[PDB]
Each structure stands twice: as structure tokens, then as C-alpha cells.
Amino acid sequence: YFQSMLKIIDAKVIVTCPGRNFVTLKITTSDGVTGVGDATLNGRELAVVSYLRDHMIPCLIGRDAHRIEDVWQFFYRGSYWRGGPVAMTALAAVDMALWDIKAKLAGMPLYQLLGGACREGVMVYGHANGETIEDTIAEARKYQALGYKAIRLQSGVPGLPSTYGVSGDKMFYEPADGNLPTENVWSTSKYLKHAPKLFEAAREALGDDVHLLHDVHHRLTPIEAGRLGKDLEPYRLFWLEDAVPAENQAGFRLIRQHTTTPLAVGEIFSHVWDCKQLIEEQLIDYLRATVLHAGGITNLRKIAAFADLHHVRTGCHGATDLSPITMAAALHFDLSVSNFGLQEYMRHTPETDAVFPHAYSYKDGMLHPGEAPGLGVDIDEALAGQYPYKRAYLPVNRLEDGTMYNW
Amino acid sequence: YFQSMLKIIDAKVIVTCPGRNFVTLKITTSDGVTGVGDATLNGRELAVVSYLRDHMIPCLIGRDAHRIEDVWQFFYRGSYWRGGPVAMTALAAVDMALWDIKAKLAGMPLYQLLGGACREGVMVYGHANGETIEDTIAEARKYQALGYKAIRLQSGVPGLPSTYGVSGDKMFYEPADGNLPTENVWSTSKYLKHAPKLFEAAREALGDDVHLLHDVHHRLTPIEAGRLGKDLEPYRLFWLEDAVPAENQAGFRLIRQHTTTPLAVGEIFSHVWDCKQLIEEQLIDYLRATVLHAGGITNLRKIAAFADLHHVRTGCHGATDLSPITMAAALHFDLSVSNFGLQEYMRHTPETDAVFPHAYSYKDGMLHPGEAPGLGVDIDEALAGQYPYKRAYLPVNRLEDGTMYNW
Amino acid sequence: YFQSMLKIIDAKVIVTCPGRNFVTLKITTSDGVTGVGDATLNGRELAVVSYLRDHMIPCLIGRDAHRIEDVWQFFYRGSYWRGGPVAMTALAAVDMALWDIKAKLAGMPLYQLLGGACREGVMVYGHANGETIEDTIAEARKYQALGYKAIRLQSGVPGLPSTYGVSGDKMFYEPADGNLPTENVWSTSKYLKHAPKLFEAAREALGDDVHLLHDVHHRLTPIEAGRLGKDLEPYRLFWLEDAVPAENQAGFRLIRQHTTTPLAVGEIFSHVWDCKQLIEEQLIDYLRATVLHAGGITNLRKIAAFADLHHVRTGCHGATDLSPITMAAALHFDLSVSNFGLQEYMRHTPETDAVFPHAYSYKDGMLHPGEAPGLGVDIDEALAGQYPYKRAYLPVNRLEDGTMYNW
Amino acid sequence: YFQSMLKIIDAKVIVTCPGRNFVTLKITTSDGVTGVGDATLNGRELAVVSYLRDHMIPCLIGRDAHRIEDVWQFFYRGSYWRGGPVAMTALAAVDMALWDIKAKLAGMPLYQLLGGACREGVMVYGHANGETIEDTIAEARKYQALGYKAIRLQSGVPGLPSTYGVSGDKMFYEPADGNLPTENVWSTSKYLKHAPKLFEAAREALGDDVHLLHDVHHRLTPIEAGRLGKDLEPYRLFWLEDAVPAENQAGFRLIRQHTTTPLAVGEIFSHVWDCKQLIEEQLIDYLRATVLHAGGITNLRKIAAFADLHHVRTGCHGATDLSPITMAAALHFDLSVSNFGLQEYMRHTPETDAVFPHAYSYKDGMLHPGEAPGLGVDIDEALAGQYPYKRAYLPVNRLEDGTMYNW
Ligand SMILES: [Cl-]
Ligand SMILES: [Cl-]
Ligand SMILES: [Cl-]
Ligand SMILES: [Cl-]
Ligand SMILES: [Cl-]
Ligand SMILES: [Cl-]
Ligand SMILES: [Cl-]
Ligand SMILES: [Cl-]
Ligand SMILES: [Cl-]
Ligand SMILES: [Cl-]
Ligand SMILES: [Mg+2]
Ligand SMILES: [Mg+2]
Ligand SMILES: [Mg+2]
Ligand SMILES: [Mg+2]
């Protein structure tokens, strides 16, 4: 035998909007084996397109496709300016595509390369939202009837025109809805009094077996989050998510000091450095970082092993802005990681599913990555060409006095 | 006078199964004085048999039997690969047997060498289990009627086919029941809601004088354990045991931060290094490490003196898989240690008692080691020969999704 | 496609002594694909044989061979008594054999599953020993002439009959040489004055390009190690190894405080818990834990990712008591791990190489795992049968006054 | 068999001055077996006499002599006002006498009850003092010629009439020489410049094999001690003792930060609380606390086990004001403790040896406790009656300006 080099002979970025924007990388190797990776960065999509097309891809051509770790370190260190959502999301696409290729050459679904199956499927949660508590609870009943064992509840705040998680969309939430960003208004005090009522009513209506989750969406200070967690303790939430802006990781110390409600954070994190203190101080229970926005399978696996030393479990973000390619990768990761916690699942539109055909599927409150070789996913480029990019921004949020705040 | 060397002239390992597996070491010295030690490691018994027969014993022959500490350091450091349950359990058998010999030469029950009696007897707890709370409480009444001042309560979790501590055995629990390991299924959420009801009903039925204990059996995360401890505070438990897997000792910081329910851990520990942080940070109230699995009388005494600097008391593990030889040693230790907390007591079968005749006995919620010279215990080798080894494993435990978990 | 279960249909333990004792596990799957793992625990070999044969293997038969992580967690948690050198070495054999199988099914050398190659080969060091400094330096010149870029130097201590690393063996050191353990005598003060002279002369003779290493072999206290490190600073050692017994991990704080000589430790570690504090406090530069004694490829990879957060690099132990099966596994690991530091290499005897035929090879100061599918190694069972087990112990070490000490 | 109570039927305190003051406790049990303990508190002797005669002894009469630990806790907790040199020295006499009795009943020298021998004898150091460096070195040569492997050096400080350790006594130092306390004058600056010259010359004259020690005698601040330790590093002292007054245990942090010279402290300590921080922070290498002044065999053993977790070794104080009864006890302790470091040995006068006949003896730089049953020591009461108490105080020390300072 000889070392086999499978050269990368081509790599391209495809942009499509089958209901929302998605950016995809497709790598082709010498013998025609291809791999794809998601590179979608909601609301800043084209920055990642240029990062890939104009800078990374020309360095990728002609490389040995087998050298996954080396390529990862090459782009991570070689950019000189290190990390960040654009670079790490661009790197995630490369990593996903190379692991797709690796598993195809091995003749196995990717999870078999990552340690094999640790569970029979991946528990998911869906998204119950409504303008009132009553509407939110009605939506949650539908998720129960659908076999979901875990449900995130989000309700409008009385006295506020809008809040995170509440829209006309039922089976998903699709926030990037402005040709310019939608402006929202916020009151912490109104929200803090209301949230516990939501869960009080929800437990009464829905019973104790179902797992209930809530996303604070970055809107509190640590002492307010400690209070909110404490008020929510009687309802035993599965997690309370993104309670406070987390750049200052020590901010979670006060929360942890004042409540036993479990804490989750990090859908926006792009590297281990965004959560190292959170994890090593046991300040959170679930890490929400994803293969898409934190640098691929390669990096998320490393982070998850670190998390497992500190009683932290995975709770990967799963909003519609992560394409089916991310979902495939995420599911191979979730099926094989020992310290799995929960997987978010917002349904994509039928058009998105058709552009990104995949083997994964839902059954009885669980997703499963399927048994096809590779990620078990691809892009239909002809169909993708029928849905041109359309600019869309995430909303922003301001205080009652106009102060710029967190959405 | 001259230094007297009492040479070890023989040492052998006897395996017997008078109801369950037991491994025993018997050392003979030049003048015929013998000592025995327990070497039983539930579910991995024969690994310790080989560790002793094939490696340790040949180094033991011809040594001065008086040099207890030196022999201890010889095997502990000399194995090169240090500690671990197999090695420390093997070393525990040696240490117990040498202390048996030492006390016999001194003409005294062992506790007289270890500082003398500090109490009139050793308070014990027994094991009330039942499929329902009602059955568990009925079992606890029987223990009260038997004079037990302390009782561990364990109840089935509704919606779960089985849980730790609950079986058809009443006066004891005998888990190693599989020719292969029994698989169990687990739900933390079902358990967390149920456990407090058990103790609410138990206090109402049983009154406030009796000490009530609970064994979580490794199944929670620190934040869940903090919650469970908090929910149990109104019932004033004597201890809440093995709340979380303890390899990461800092994990107990969150528990201690959120509850005043007293904490116990460590039946599986094999050395001081498994609990040094727990003790020095005052993260626990009772250490459950035993003479059998943490390296004998010599080492447990050292650990207990360290524990006494930090308000930690002994709460030695006492399941049926510790033979009467361990029980004898444990009782000499418990009677003489100043910072004694409680001793676990599961009754052995009549056949086990006959194979291991002993002076210790139960009366009015207490055990006492007896006044015979030595440990006050021996093995009847002829009777032991009538009960051949039979393979039996401890159960395992998995989450609802198949994830490998803690039993 | 369907989930493919490749059942384990057989597993056996083979013991052989082609120059020294080796224990091997061989797993056979339904279609005849086999994998092997090393289970050798120097000086306590047969304890691991029984741990595997009598307890683990019967649980292994009929399992899905693809489920590597699940099997790992099954044995690690399921033993109930957790970790320890016997259990983790037994588990390492299972893990190595399953990864061998996985890579064979994938049609790839194992390193391709673990991230691909990160380097063109694996830098090694050899072992220069001699009774005097002059003899040690003469031996080091031979290693230089052999293309070794890194060399460990160990010299006799004047006034002491023997010391670690110094024997009649030149291309390797084979300590387990007693039908009972050889007793050695030790003086720290003689050693502390002498070691720096060794390296002073060595730099003068050998130049500055070559990497020089030293193994303290557990013999100092932290303040003595700080002094020794300081005295060695002018000679810029690659690492100073096992300076102090490391059960108390905080012991390395004083060393780190007083010297910039790089530190390595952990050939004896069996799990991440033996080094978590060392790593997270940046108290060491190289972790010496191995796939053999710390629970296989699966676990060492996890530990290495943790190490990479803290500037720690791998420096895997490589003495002759790790069989060629471990070496193969270690090399696949070393080639693919990003934070590689150095690999120890003691040459095996020709008879050992013949019993364990392998693809890895040495060239110009580097080893390379080779490109065969799997680990690239196997056992020749017929030849192995010609070399029956022969009992052999590691030496022990005592102070000048007889006190039991560290070898 | 029945529990045997050996009642204490009498206990008395004998005061004698065979060269210096000694206080002794003698306990008699029902069958005539007796035990003795030292209660000497240099310079405050009669306070301990009254503490015993007037308060403790009447509570002792009629107690079970076998209950060593219980008696210890009885006096330690029961005094209400806890610890202190008077109470703990009084308690030490009781503990020594009870352990003497216990070993006599067992028919063994005491070390056999405390774990057996860990070494062939107990390394000691003697006391070289002189007015000049030259005289000090001349005295050290005599100790070498006597087979001492370790020697404390103390020299006069030029420009100062006197300093600690320097007197007309050669084989010992006998400071309590005032019918009122002798006043001394002190200059730290003169001392700091001089001490390193002493050891520079001493190494040159005496060679590198011999262990050299120095007693700072409480006279520096931490930053000065750090400097002195640093200046002494080239001469590799065995220890630097009592560098700073140690009530503030954190004071040793600065020393440890600035020097690798090993540190010893604690001849004056009366309980574990005087050194818990020193030990747990690894701020010292040798604990100097003794069986006499820190509460007997029972308590020193506990402290030594704690010390062994932190790389601390025993370095028991051994000045002439500890009677041969303490020396006997100390030697049984030193022979049997695993983490032994060194034992101080100042020779008693011939008259003292005759009043306190004993089995221990010196040979080749070592003491050995002997093989007689018990402590191997007694008091000759008739001879003791020939040497009436004579008041004698320890010296005091003041700064050049009159400021009260530390002797
Ligand atoms: Cl493109
Ligand atoms: Cl509402
Ligand atoms: Cl046997
Ligand atoms: Cl082990
Ligand atoms: Cl019930
Ligand atoms: Cl076999
Ligand atoms: Cl030499
Ligand atoms: Cl009197
Ligand atoms: Cl006092
Ligand atoms: Cl002078
Ligand atoms: Mg969110
Ligand atoms: Mg338990
Ligand atoms: Mg080594
Ligand atoms: Mg002194």
C-alpha cells in the first residue's frame, strides 16, 4: 500500500433562497467523490461567500482531501486574524464537506467514524409560540400530539407589540424578515413578571413529563436572570437559554449562585474561547454551539469532550437558518457524542428540503441521521438555481427610551 | 529482648459463593498464627484473585509479618502503576490479615490497638425498599420495630420498570444477579419529582426521631442534586448519598452551594486522592470509603484523620458484597475512630455467616465487633469448599434513548 | 441502506513472552474481520488477563463492533468500581481492537479516521544510559549517529550501586528483571548534585541542536524538583519527567513556580482525572499518558483535546512493556493529533517484532505508522505459543535507612 | 472473652532536676502495670504540674486505661478552653503513659502497635556551635567523626555579644540558664550578611555528603527569610528552621515564593491548628512539632498523616528539655512513621540518663528505640528525689533600640 492522496480538484459556493437564504460549499475530489458543507451566516450571508470564494478556496484547490485536521489548522491559524463568526462559519463548511468525503470513502454514515451510535435516536424540541399564554399553550399541545418530548415555549409580553419567538409561523420561527432590520421595543420588567406565569399555566395544562424550555434571548442582567431562574424553579424547566449577553463569561456566576434552573447558552459562539470559562467553572448545563457556527465537526467534537469533564451536555442550536446540511452533520455528531443533551429542530420549508435532499428523518420526538454514506445529504444545484438570493436581516431590539439593546 | 521477626510462611486465596461471591486471603506465620482479609471486588472478583495469587503473594512470603506499614508502602508504591480498585482491594486483604495477626499476638481485639473504644457500639442503618412509596414505608416500619435508629429508603419510580435499591430482597439488596449484567432504563425527571414525595410520606408515617437516608446512586448532575437536596430539606435526611458521579470533585461545589441536606459519597473510592478535594473544601459530611476498597485499616485510618480536620465523619459502605471479614474490620475501625458517623449494615445469608464465623453481633440498632483477639473472624475452609464460585455481574443503567449511563 | 451490525463473535486473550511478557486481545467479527489490542500491564500482567477473560469478554460477545464509544462507556461505567490501571488497560485493549476493526472496514490506516496526517512523521527519542557520565555521553553519540533528534540521558549516581535508566541494555531498558522485585537504594542529595553535571558535560559534547531529556523517576519533592529544574536551565532540556509523585497534582505548582525547565509526567496515569488539575493549571508541558494505560485511542484523544486548550502537548510513554500493538496505535494517534510533542521509542527484541508483525518503521529520527488498513499490526498466534509467560517484576527502591520509596 | 477494663488506680507527677528541670507523669493500673509520660514545659514547668495534679489527674483516676482516644478527646474537649502549650503538654504526658501501658500489655515495643518498623533506625542531627565560623566548623568536624550524617550549624554574629545556639555547651545547648531570663541583643542586618558565609565555609571544609541545617530562631520577616533562603541555596541545606514567627501562617507564602531552600518549623506548636495552613499550602518541608508539646503519640500521628498528603515529613524537635521519656516516645513514632524526615538529638547529662533509664541508643548517626515492651523507659523515683526542682528561664531577645523581640 501507498499513502493515498485524494486531491481536491474543485470547490464552489452556491447561494440559494428556497424560502430563506442558504450558502453551500461543494468540494470535488480527483475521482469524482464530492462533499458539501453549510456556510450560512444569517443576515451576513455574503461576507462568508466572499471569505470562501475570494480567499479560502484558492488555497484549498489541489490539497489532499484526507488531511482534515491539517486543513482545519491551516485555515484557523493561517488567516492570521483568528476566529470570528465569518471565518469559523467558512471553516465549518470546509470541515463538513471534508468529513462528508471521508465517510463516503469509508463507505459509512459519518457517525460511524465519530465513535458509532450512542443512542437509538436524537431527542429534539420544537417551538411553541403565541401572542398570549393561551395561544402558546395551544401550540404546545400540538407539539405534544406530534410526539415531541421537549418543547420550547415563548409568549408575547403584555404591553409589548412583539418579543422573541412569537410570530405567525407555527412549526418554525423565521425572524430574518426585513429588507432592512425590523425594530422591536423591549421592557425587562414587564417580561420578568410575565415569564413565570407562562410556565405556571403550561405545567398545569401540559403535565410534568414533557420537557419545557425557554429562550431569554440575551435580554437580562445576571441578577435579573438569577431572579427569573428562581421564579421558574417550581416548573422544572429543561433549560433557560441565553439569559444574559455572555461575552463576559463571569456574568453567569451570579446566575448559578441564585438558581438551580438549568442554563444553556452559545448558539452564537464561534470557538471554544467563547465558552471555556463557562464550562470550566460549571456555570452552564448545555452548550448550544453548533457545527455550523463554531468551526465544524472537528472543532465541536473537541469542545464536547472538554464539556464532558464538567458535566456539560450538548444542546445544539437548530433554527431554520442552519440548512439541512448542518442538520445532517449535527445529527451524526448528536448520535455519536456521549454527553448529548438535546437537539433543536425547526422544520424547513418543503422547497428547502427539495433543494437539499437528505436521509435524516423525524419519528416519535427524535431525529436520526440515516444510514447513507457520508453526511447523507447533497445539494440539487439545478433546483437551487431557481431560487435567487434575497437580502434579509435579523431584527434588532431597543429599550423603551430608544437605547440600542439585544435582540 | 531482641527484635522479633514473625515470618510469613504461607498465604493463599480462597474463593467461595455461599449465596454470593467472596474472595479471602489467609496468611500463616511461622508459629501458626493466621490472619484473614477480605478481597472481594463485586463483579470483577477474579481480577483480584490473580492480582494476589500471581503477583502480590510471592512477594509476601518470607516477609516480617510485624511490618504492616512497610508492607503497605511496598505494595502501594511497588506496583509502579499506583492505586485503582483491583490493587487497593488486594492490598486491603493483606492489611486486614496483618492487623488480624498483630492483634492476636497482642492478645487483644483489634479496636484496642487502634485507640480503644470511643463508644458503646456502632450505630447502623438498614435498607427499606419497595416498588411503591407505601411498600417502602411498610418495610421501614419493620426496621423500626427491629430497633434500627437509621433507615435508608428507596422506592420504585413510577413509569420506570426498576430503580436502585428496589428488589424482592427485604433485609438486604443483592444486585449482582446477572450471568450477564441486567440492563435498566432511567429517567432523571421522573425520579426528581418522585423522591421528595417518598420522604414527605415517610416523615408523616415514621415520625421525626428516626434517621432517614437516601442513595441517589450516581444519577444526577450537580445542579439537579442541588435541587433534590433542597426539595428534601423539610424532611431532614441524615444524608443524601452519591448524588453525582464524583470523579470531578469540584462537582460537589454546586450541590453544597444550593442545599443544606447533608451529603455522603465514596463507597467506590480506592484512595485518599478520590476524595481529597471533597474533604478539604468541606463539600461532604460523610465519607463512605471502606477498609475493603480503599486499602485496609491502615489507609482508612489515615483518611479518617484527614476527614476529622474538616468536619467529615465516617459513613462506611456495608453492602453484602463486603464479607463478614470486612464487617469485622470495619467494626473495629468504627468503634475506635473518633469521627464516626454511621455504618451501613446489610444482612448476609446464613450460609455466608457459617462460612465466616465471627464475634460481632447486632443489638438495638448497633453492631459491636466483639472481644475476641484479632478481627474476631475466620474462614471455615472446608465449608467454603462446598460453595464454588459462580459468575455474577452488577447491573448497568441507560437513559431512555439508549445512552450508556450510571447504575 | 440499513444499519449494519457487525457482531463480535469471539474474543480471546493471548499471553506470550518473546523476550518479555505481553498480553493481547483479539476480537473476531461475523465476517472474519479481526482486531487486536495490547493489554500488557508490566508486573501485574495476569490481573488484566483475568479482568478480560473472566469479566469483560463474556459481555463483549455478540455486541455490535461498530459501537466504539458505547462499548467504552459500557465498560468504564459498568464496572461500577471506576478506572484504575487494571480496568483501563483492559479497556484500552478493547478500544484498540475495535478501532483496528473500524479502520479495516473503512479500508484505511487508522490515522485517516482520526483526522488525517498532521505531519510527515513522528519524532522519537531513544535512551542513552551509562554507569558514568562518560559512558552515558558515549551512548548518546551513538543515538545521534542513528539520526535521533532527541535523546534521554540517564547516568549512574556516584556512591549508589544503581539508578533508574542505567543497565547493560543499550538500545532499550528492560527493568522487569526479577523473579522477585530487585531492591535498589537511593539518595536524593547525591542525585541532585550529580544530574546537572551530566547535562553540563552532555551539552559540551553533543552540541545545542539535539533535544535532551531526563527522567527523574518519581524521586524528588516539589521543592527539590524546582531546584533541579533551575540547575538544569542552562542546558535547555526538552523535558524533565516525573519529577515528583503526582497523586497530589498541586505538587507541581511549586516546581512551576521555581523553574522554566519544561515538565512532563504521566506514563502511569489511567484516566483524565489523574491529570486534570496539572493540565488546567498549566503545570506541565507534556502529557505522557498512553493509549495502553489510559483507556485506548478513544480516551487519549479526548484527553489530548483538553490538553490543547492549555498549551500541553503529547509525549507518550514508549517503553518495551508497551507491545508493538500499542506502538502501532500510538503512532496512528501521534501522526494525527495536532498538539503532538514527542514519542518515546525503545526498541523491541527481534522475537517480539516477529510475534507482532507490523507496518510501522523508523527513519531519520522518526517513526511512521505505515499505510496498511487498520492499526497495521497483528499477532502471529502460532509463534506466540512458542514463548510461554514468565513471571517478572519491576524493581523497587528504598531510602538509605530502609524507608520504602519510589522506583 | 469479656471486655477487659484495666482501671487506673493512681497517677502522680514527679518533678526532678538532674541537670535541668523535668516533669513526669506516672500512671498505675489495677494489676500494677505502670506507664510514664513527659510533661516538661521549659521555663513554665510548674504550670503543667498544677494543670495535671490539681485538675486532670482527679478525672483520670478510675478510668479504663485501654481507652486512649476517648481519654484524649475527654481532656482536649473537656477543658472547655481548648489547646495551648500547657494543656497539650499535660495531655501529651497522659497519652504517652497510656500508650506505654498499652504496648506493655501487648508485650511489644510501642512502634509495633503504630504500624511496625519502616526503617532500620532513625537518622539524627547534632548541634555544632561556636563563637566564630572557624569554631563552628571545628565542632561540626567532631560530629562528623562521631558518625552524624546531619549537623546543625550555629555561629556567633560578629558585632553581637550572643546569638541562638552558641554557648559553652558542645554536645548540647542548654539555654534555660537564668534564675531570671538572660537578655540578649539582636541585629537582623548583621545576621543576614553573616549566615551565608558560615555555610559557604562549612561546605568547603566539610564536603557535600553531610546534611547541614540551620535554625533562624524566629528572627526574620518573610521577605528577609526569602532572601536568606536564596543566599543559602548554593550550599543545599537540609532545612532552614523557624525562619519567621509563624502565628500568621500565610507569612510562609513569601518565603516559599522566593527560595527553594527547604523549610522547617513548629517545635513550639501545640496542635494541628498551628500548622494546618502551612501544610495544606505546601509552605514547609518538615514539621518540627513533637509528641511532648503537641498532645502525644495520638495527636502527632494524626498530624503526620495529614502532612503526608502534602509532601511534608517529620522533623521532630529534640532539645534537652524533652526528657528521655519524650525521646523514647519520639523514637517509636519516628521508626514507624512512613514520612519520617529527621530527628533532633541533643545529649542529656549522665544524671538525666540515670534518672530515666531507657532502651534507646545511638549508633552510626542513628537512634533506635530498642525492643523492650512499652516505651522502653521508666523513672527511678528514689534517684529523682535527690535532685530538687530549680527555677530556670529561657532567655529573651531585644532589638538594638530595646524593642521586645523573639528569642
Ligand atoms: Cl464559487
Ligand atoms: Cl397572556
Ligand atoms: Cl491461592
Ligand atoms: Cl485497578
Ligand atoms: Cl409510589
Ligand atoms: Cl482467552
Ligand atoms: Cl560520572
Ligand atoms: Cl502528684
Ligand atoms: Cl495554655
Ligand atoms: Cl566568624
Ligand atoms: Mg436561542
Ligand atoms: Mg450506595
Ligand atoms: Mg518514565
Ligand atoms: Mg529550633
Side-chain angles (χ1 to χ4, degrees), chain A residues 19 21 114 151 178 183 199 234 245 297 309 327:
Chain A
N21 295 312
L114 304 185
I151 314 175
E183 309 256 333
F199 288 83
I297 289 289
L309 299 179
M327 186 58 89

PDB file of all heavy atoms in Angstrom, chain A residues 19 21 114 151 178 183 199 234 245 297 309 327:
ATOM      1  N   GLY A  19     -37.008  29.789   0.242  1.00  0.00           N
ATOM      2  CA  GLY A  19     -37.721  30.139   1.466  1.00  0.00           C
ATOM      3  C   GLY A  19     -36.914  31.020   2.404  1.00  0.00           C
ATOM      4  O   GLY A  19     -37.475  31.850   3.124  1.00  0.00           O
ATOM      5  N   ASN A  21     -32.377  32.430   2.806  1.00  0.00           N
ATOM      6  CA  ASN A  21     -31.030  32.280   2.268  1.00  0.00           C
ATOM      7  C   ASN A  21     -30.204  31.121   2.834  1.00  0.00           C
ATOM      8  O   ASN A  21     -30.135  30.916   4.047  1.00  0.00           O
ATOM      9  CB  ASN A  21     -30.263  33.594   2.413  1.00  0.00           C
ATOM     10  CG  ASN A  21     -30.863  34.702   1.572  1.00  0.00           C
ATOM     11  OD1 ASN A  21     -31.148  34.499   0.391  1.00  0.00           O
ATOM     12  ND2 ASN A  21     -31.047  35.886   2.168  1.00  0.00           N
ATOM     13  N   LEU A 114     -17.170   8.651  13.970  1.00  0.00           N
ATOM     14  CA  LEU A 114     -17.072   9.550  15.120  1.00  0.00           C
ATOM     15  C   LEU A 114     -17.320   8.808  16.420  1.00  0.00           C
ATOM     16  O   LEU A 114     -17.607   9.409  17.452  1.00  0.00           O
ATOM     17  CB  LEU A 114     -18.089  10.686  14.995  1.00  0.00           C
ATOM     18  CG  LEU A 114     -17.979  11.492  13.704  1.00  0.00           C
ATOM     19  CD1 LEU A 114     -18.948  12.668  13.712  1.00  0.00           C
ATOM     20  CD2 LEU A 114     -16.555  11.968  13.512  1.00  0.00           C
ATOM     21  N   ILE A 151     -40.334  20.838  24.471  1.00  0.00           N
ATOM     22  CA  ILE A 151     -40.952  21.945  23.764  1.00  0.00           C
ATOM     23  C   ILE A 151     -40.494  23.260  24.329  1.00  0.00           C
ATOM     24  O   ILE A 151     -40.570  23.486  25.529  1.00  0.00           O
ATOM     25  CB  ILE A 151     -42.483  21.908  23.894  1.00  0.00           C
ATOM     26  CG1 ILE A 151     -43.008  20.475  23.639  1.00  0.00           C
ATOM     27  CG2 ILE A 151     -43.105  22.912  22.941  1.00  0.00           C
ATOM     28  CD1 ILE A 151     -44.503  20.313  23.853  1.00  0.00           C
ATOM     29  N   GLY A 178     -36.748  41.250   7.276  1.00  0.00           N
ATOM     30  CA  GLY A 178     -36.680  42.636   6.851  1.00  0.00           C
ATOM     31  C   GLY A 178     -35.720  42.818   5.697  1.00  0.00           C
ATOM     32  O   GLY A 178     -34.612  42.283   5.719  1.00  0.00           O
ATOM     33  N   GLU A 183     -37.355  46.809  13.758  1.00  0.00           N
ATOM     34  CA  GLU A 183     -37.066  47.347  15.090  1.00  0.00           C
ATOM     35  C   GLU A 183     -38.130  46.905  16.084  1.00  0.00           C
ATOM     36  O   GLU A 183     -39.326  46.973  15.808  1.00  0.00           O
ATOM     37  CB  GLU A 183     -37.007  48.879  15.058  1.00  0.00           C
ATOM     38  CG  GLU A 183     -36.108  49.463  13.978  1.00  0.00           C
ATOM     39  CD  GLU A 183     -34.784  49.971  14.516  1.00  0.00           C
ATOM     40  OE1 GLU A 183     -34.727  50.353  15.704  1.00  0.00           O
ATOM     41  OE2 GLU A 183     -33.801  50.017  13.740  1.00  0.00           O
ATOM     42  N   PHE A 199     -45.090  29.633  32.407  1.00  0.00           N
ATOM     43  CA  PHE A 199     -44.726  28.268  32.780  1.00  0.00           C
ATOM     44  C   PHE A 199     -45.604  27.703  33.880  1.00  0.00           C
ATOM     45  O   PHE A 199     -45.810  26.487  33.952  1.00  0.00           O
ATOM     46  CB  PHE A 199     -43.221  28.172  33.072  1.00  0.00           C
ATOM     47  CG  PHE A 199     -42.414  28.263  31.824  1.00  0.00           C
ATOM     48  CD1 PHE A 199     -42.100  29.506  31.279  1.00  0.00           C
ATOM     49  CD2 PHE A 199     -42.084  27.113  31.122  1.00  0.00           C
ATOM     50  CE1 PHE A 199     -41.404  29.596  30.084  1.00  0.00           C
ATOM     51  CE2 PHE A 199     -41.382  27.200  29.937  1.00  0.00           C
ATOM     52  CZ  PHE A 199     -41.039  28.444  29.421  1.00  0.00           C
ATOM     53  N   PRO A 234     -40.151  26.242  40.327  1.00  0.00           N
ATOM     54  CA  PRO A 234     -41.224  25.265  40.602  1.00  0.00           C
ATOM     55  C   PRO A 234     -41.677  24.499  39.356  1.00  0.00           C
ATOM     56  O   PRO A 234     -42.278  23.445  39.482  1.00  0.00           O
ATOM     57  CB  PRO A 234     -42.373  26.128  41.150  1.00  0.00           C
ATOM     58  CG  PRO A 234     -41.678  27.353  41.704  1.00  0.00           C
ATOM     59  CD  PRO A 234     -40.500  27.600  40.786  1.00  0.00           C
ATOM     60  N   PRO A 245     -26.206  38.502  27.859  1.00  0.00           N
ATOM     61  CA  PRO A 245     -25.122  38.537  26.892  1.00  0.00           C
ATOM     62  C   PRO A 245     -23.888  37.937  27.564  1.00  0.00           C
ATOM     63  O   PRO A 245     -23.531  38.336  28.679  1.00  0.00           O
ATOM     64  CB  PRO A 245     -24.906  40.035  26.619  1.00  0.00           C
ATOM     65  CG  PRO A 245     -26.058  40.753  27.232  1.00  0.00           C
ATOM     66  CD  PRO A 245     -26.750  39.832  28.196  1.00  0.00           C
ATOM     67  N   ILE A 297     -17.498  19.822  12.531  1.00  0.00           N
ATOM     68  CA  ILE A 297     -17.446  18.584  13.289  1.00  0.00           C
ATOM     69  C   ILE A 297     -16.154  18.484  14.096  1.00  0.00           C
ATOM     70  O   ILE A 297     -16.153  18.087  15.276  1.00  0.00           O
ATOM     71  CB  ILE A 297     -17.489  17.390  12.308  1.00  0.00           C
ATOM     72  CG1 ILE A 297     -18.863  17.270  11.688  1.00  0.00           C
ATOM     73  CG2 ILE A 297     -17.139  16.085  13.005  1.00  0.00           C
ATOM     74  CD1 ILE A 297     -19.905  16.799  12.683  1.00  0.00           C
ATOM     75  N   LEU A 309     -16.019  16.955  30.770  1.00  0.00           N
ATOM     76  CA  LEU A 309     -15.229  16.915  32.008  1.00  0.00           C
ATOM     77  C   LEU A 309     -15.919  17.691  33.124  1.00  0.00           C
ATOM     78  O   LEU A 309     -15.541  17.601  34.298  1.00  0.00           O
ATOM     79  CB  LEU A 309     -13.812  17.473  31.787  1.00  0.00           C
ATOM     80  CG  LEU A 309     -12.971  16.709  30.757  1.00  0.00           C
ATOM     81  CD1 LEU A 309     -11.617  17.363  30.618  1.00  0.00           C
ATOM     82  CD2 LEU A 309     -12.817  15.238  31.143  1.00  0.00           C
ATOM     83  N   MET A 327     -27.955  20.292   9.556  1.00  0.00           N
ATOM     84  CA  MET A 327     -28.741  19.324  10.317  1.00  0.00           C
ATOM     85  C   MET A 327     -28.184  17.921  10.175  1.00  0.00           C
ATOM     86  O   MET A 327     -27.991  17.230  11.168  1.00  0.00           O
ATOM     87  CB  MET A 327     -30.241  19.360  10.020  1.00  0.00           C
ATOM     88  CG  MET A 327     -31.039  18.427  10.938  1.00  0.00           C
ATOM     89  SD  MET A 327     -30.899  18.726  12.732  1.00  0.00           S
ATOM     90  CE  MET A 327     -32.242  19.901  12.949  1.00  0.00           C
TER      91      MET A 327
END
